[PDB]
Amino acid sequence: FEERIVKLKRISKTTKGGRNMRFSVLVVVGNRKGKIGYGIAKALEVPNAIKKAIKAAHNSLHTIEIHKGSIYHEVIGRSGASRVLLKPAPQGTGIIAGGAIRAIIELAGYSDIYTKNLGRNTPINMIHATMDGILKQLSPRRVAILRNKNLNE
Amino acid sequence: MKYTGSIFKRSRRLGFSLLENNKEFSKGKKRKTIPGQHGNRFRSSTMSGYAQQLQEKQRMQYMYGITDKQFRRLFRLVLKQRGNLAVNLFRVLESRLDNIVYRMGFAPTRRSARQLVNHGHVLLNDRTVDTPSIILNPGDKVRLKAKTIKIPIVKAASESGVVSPFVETNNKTFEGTYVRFPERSELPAGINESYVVEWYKRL
Amino acid sequence: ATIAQLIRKPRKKKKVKSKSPALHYNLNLLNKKVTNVYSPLKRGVCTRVGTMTPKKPNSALRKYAKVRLTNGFEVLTYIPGEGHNLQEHSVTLLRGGRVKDLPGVRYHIVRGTLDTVGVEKRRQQRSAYGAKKPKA
Amino acid sequence: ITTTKPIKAHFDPVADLLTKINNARKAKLMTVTTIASKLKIAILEILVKEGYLANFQVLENKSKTKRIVTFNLKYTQRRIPSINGVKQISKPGLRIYRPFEKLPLVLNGLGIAIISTSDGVMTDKVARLKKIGGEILAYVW
Amino acid sequence: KRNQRKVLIGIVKSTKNAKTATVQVESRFKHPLYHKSVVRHKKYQAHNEGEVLAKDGDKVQIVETRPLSATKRFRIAKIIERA
Amino acid sequence: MVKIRLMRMGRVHYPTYRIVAVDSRVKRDGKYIALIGHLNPALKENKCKIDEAVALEWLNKGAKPTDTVRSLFSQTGLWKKFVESKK
RNA sequence: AUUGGGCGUAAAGCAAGCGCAGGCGGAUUGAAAAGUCUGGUGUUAAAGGCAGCUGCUUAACAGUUGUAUGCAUUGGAAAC
RNA sequence: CAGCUAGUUGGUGGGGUAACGGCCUACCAAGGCAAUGACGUGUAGCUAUGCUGAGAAGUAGAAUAGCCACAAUGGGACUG
User: Fold this and answer.
1) Which of A36, A108, A121, B35 has CA atoms 20 to 30 A from the CA of A14?
2) Which chains touch C (3 or more CB pairs under 8 A)?
3) Chain D, 65-124: which have a CB under 8 Å from a chain A CB?
4) Residues in CB range of F2: below 8 A, 6 or more apart
5) Could you tell me if B109 and B171 lie in one domain?
6) CATH code at position B23
7) How many domains are contained in chain E?
8) Is residue B74 in a domain?
9) Cα torsion at C95, C100, C105, C111 (round to 10°)?
10) CA distances from D92 to D12, D85, D96, D137, F42 (A)
11) Quick one: three-class SS letters along chain A?
């Protein structure tokens, strides 16, 4: 649980005679062993927005598995016309990715992984594509159970 | 240039003792603020990944007395082989002749030890040396040339020296040996070598 | 498209052009012909010296030059620094680089070159504007 | 028996099969009908010996003029199929041909690839054991 | 006997030129980077010896030889029936 | 005449010759047919190993050694296995 | 964008039709075997690249050995 | 850049050439190449390789090496 932020944005809506500059923030929090959650929340000042985002993130976590410290099979993260590629790197190479990708993967307590952005690069879509790719991943035990070849084949 | 102007300022901003523990040990009321006219309050406001990664890089190469391009060459050479990255890189950096002279404890500082090495005062495996970038391997024997022992600066270090278990020495005969590779926890750990090693995507 | 179509019609790149082509063309005498040998920098001789106003966001008065290359090309060029030594048919030397304030102008003078003497009283970075190391 | 409903095959057998299997998987259906071909047969049994689908019976009329085949897909009580993704590399006019030394492994071995080298359909791992490369039918994972 | 041969089945287009026939060949090759397969024509030349008068539709075989003349470079080896 | 000559393959001040089966009408350090060991005529005490396999074939189908190649052919005993098998 | 892109409103489906050439094309049985797959042989200069090693006080560097690739030809296979 | 080519296409006799050959020669016929791009335009020594890229490969042909062409420019031939 390091709750590293990724990007704060000075968003604003317009009202008669003035601008409601209400900057928000996106945060990623991870137990470093499988718990991952992200929080986007809007507030008038930094610390309260940070607290709201952390509460939203830690409220809704979810688990993920470890295969030699890394993903084991190919996947493409399809989310809102923004693809991110994940490849099962060999053990030694270590983490290599951008800002949000490194945030998500390291906060997941992973290791070696091969990454490359495709299409857009707005952080929220990056996070969505990465989570969708990481969760649509099937475990070999799960596919083995639904197969008749569960005996390591 | 291969030599640096001031050393305590480096420990000031880097926040890492260039010495064992006496870099900021209240020497003349030693401090820990960043140097320059603006040490009042720049605590942590723009702590980015790139900033701290540069911080660990400079920490890694200031206490070794290295410069950029040769450090890049060292990283490439250690990347040439097979194994784990950070520990092998640190092994190569601890295979430097002057660093092993410092670990011998024969000189009070790495700068004096480096001058003694350059000036021919150091003889390795019955061979004189003039290159501080020689690569030492396990089971390599070292002596003090059996010459120019009459130095006031080498003595008080020679008797008073911390014999780390990874390099053994004989005080009176001034003989040393690089037997086993130093371990990660054996050497100062105020340096996060990982941020350095994956700070290089150069190749 | 379908491979049955790309075989008929192969792909083509965009073939981006140089940011400044005038410094690339060369032409000799004695059967003159151009061989565009992509020179980093060509000399020249100024022909017109004056000033022009910049565009909308800024408001200043930038002294410009109209120099003829070692070849036949004529280019607008902006002077650097505080003051200059343009001498109305003074032989100069040219340097690339865009200027946003001046449309059309796409070059600078290497200052400290053959004739255009570098600006004196320069001590910060001392490379542009051609100032030697001051005596300590 | 007596399906009493007219059916017609789309086009090339591999695609005609993959489209139906994917649509059935998405629509949560049980079985689909199509005309039968020897290659389609071979792929059907090589799949079922991997346990990726239920009953498949080739059927003919009271004659040997028309032969059709249907198949059910491996499900669970929680109603989730055994198939995750399907994609063909071979394509009409875009046939792929792969030597054994460059044979691809689907999803680090979790998936299944169909490689009809010389003796019909066979698994990618058993072909690697055979060290026989060749044409590749489709990806199944 | 170490001389080589190129067994390439062709097709005779027209032998209108006196006692010389024109053969057409179709080699199937993979396009270098598109990996598709396409077959191209490349006309070749062989002169009529007189054994058989190849009309339109005769497809035969060809063997290498010395240069018999410019643009007439190969000779017939084996003849296959009509269709 | 195909000549067994020397080829100065090496850095400045450090000749390191590979012995070469090269034709007479070929410049120095040029393309050849077969390779004949090598030489480092700075290190002494048998730093001059030669293949001995195809060199004898070259000599048996036409070859001309040189004085520095005469030296190497002398100690290794090429002559005592060449001029007698000649008869 | 072959691996690796799209064509409703963001650039992009011709105004529509008849259509030669070309591209692709139902099912079954046999043969041949061009492609397709694999076996042998020949060949694909050195240096250079990779890896090891040797020698330079060590890299810079010099040298050694091994290392791919493609093609021709030859034995088979016969799903497509 | 839509036609291009008349020793151009093919045969006969002779000469010639280290040798094959419209290469030339005397005779006969009009053929041949071409949308799978002929002919033309401009460009350029080719290859190993260098730089980059994970890769499919993009890119220059540095030192150097194999092959090719040249020797103020254009032709000729002896001798070897």
Assistant:
1) A121
2) D, E
3) 74, 76, 80, 82, 84, 107-108, 110-111
4) F21, F22, F23, F24, F58, F62, F63, F64
5) yes
6) 1.10.1050.10
7) 1
8) yes
9) -30
10) 8, 21, 10, 11, 67
11) CCCEEEEEECCEEEECCEEEECCEEEEEEECCCCCEEEEEEECCCHHHHHHHHHHHHHHCCECCCCECCECCCCEEEECCCCEEEEECCCCCCCECCCHHHHHHHHHCCCCCEEEEECCCCCHHHHHHHHHHHHHHCCCHHHHHHCCCCCCCC
Calculate how close chain D gets to C13, using CA atoms only, in Å: 24
The three-state secondary structure class of F52 is coil
Task: Return the closest-CA partner of residue A61 out of A22, A120, A146, A3.
Answer: A3
Q: Which domain holds residue E60?
A: 1-83
Contact of D100 with D128, CB cutoff 8 Å: yes
The whole domain housing B11 covers 7-92+189-199
Name, in order, each residue with C-beta under 8 angstroms of B140's C-beta and a sequence gap of 6 or more.
B124, B125, B177, B178
The DSSP code sequence of E13-73 is: ----STTEEEEEEEEEEE-TTT--EEEEE--EEEE--SSS---TT--EEEE--S--BTTB-
Resolution of this model in Å is 3.5
Distance of alpha carbon E21 from alpha carbon E54, whole angstroms:
8
Residues in D closer than 8 angstroms to E36, CB to CB, are: 93-94
Q: Hey, where are the domains in chain F?
A: 1-87
Our measurement of CA A14 to C1' H44, in angstroms, reads: 63
Which chains lie within 8 Å of chain B at 3 or more CB pairs, if any?
A: A
Say how far E27 CA is from G29 C1', in Å: 29
Closest CA to A83 of A130, A118, A35: A118
Task: Specify the DSSP element, H or E, that contains E10.
Answer: strand E10-12
DSSP string, chain B: --S-S-SHHHHHHHTS-SSSS-SSSSTTS---S-SSTT-SS-SSSS--HHHHHHHHHHHHHHTTT--HHHHHHHHHHHHHS-S-HHHHHHHHHTTBHHHHHHHTT-SSSHHHHHHHHHTT--EETTEE---TT-B--TTEEEE-TT-----HHHHHHHHS----TTEEEETTTTEEEE-SPPPGGGS--SS-HHHHHTT----
Solved using: cryo-EM
Q: Is the CB of E17 under 7 A from strand H?
A: yes
- In angstroms, the CA A81 to CA A113 distance is 22
Q: Which of residues 8-27 of E touch strand G (CB under 7 A)?
A: none
Helical packing angle, D13-26 and D38-48, nearest 10°: 40
The helix/strand/coil state of D109 is helix
Please choose, from the candidates E5, E4, E2, the residue with its C-alpha nearest in 3D space to the C-alpha of residue E63: E5
Q: Does a structural domain hold residue B1?
A: no
DSSP C135: P
First vs last C-alpha separation in chain C: 70
Residues B47 and B128 in one domain: no
Q: Which residues contact D15 (CB under 8 A, 6 or more apart)?
A: D88, D91, D92
Q: Tell me which chain A residue has its CA closest to the CA of residue B84.
A: A92
Q: Which residues contact C47 (CB under 8 A, 6 or more apart)?
A: C66, C67, C68, C74, C89
- Asked whether B94 and B167 are in contact (CB, 8 A), the reply is no
Helices (H) and strands (E) in chain F, counts: 3, 4
Residues B194 and B150 in one domain: no
The overall longest dimension of chain F from CA atoms, in Å, is: 44
Q: Which of E28, E33, E34, E37 to mutate to test the interface with D (most CBs of D within 10 A)?
A: E37
- CA B77 – CA B93 distance, rounded (Å): 11
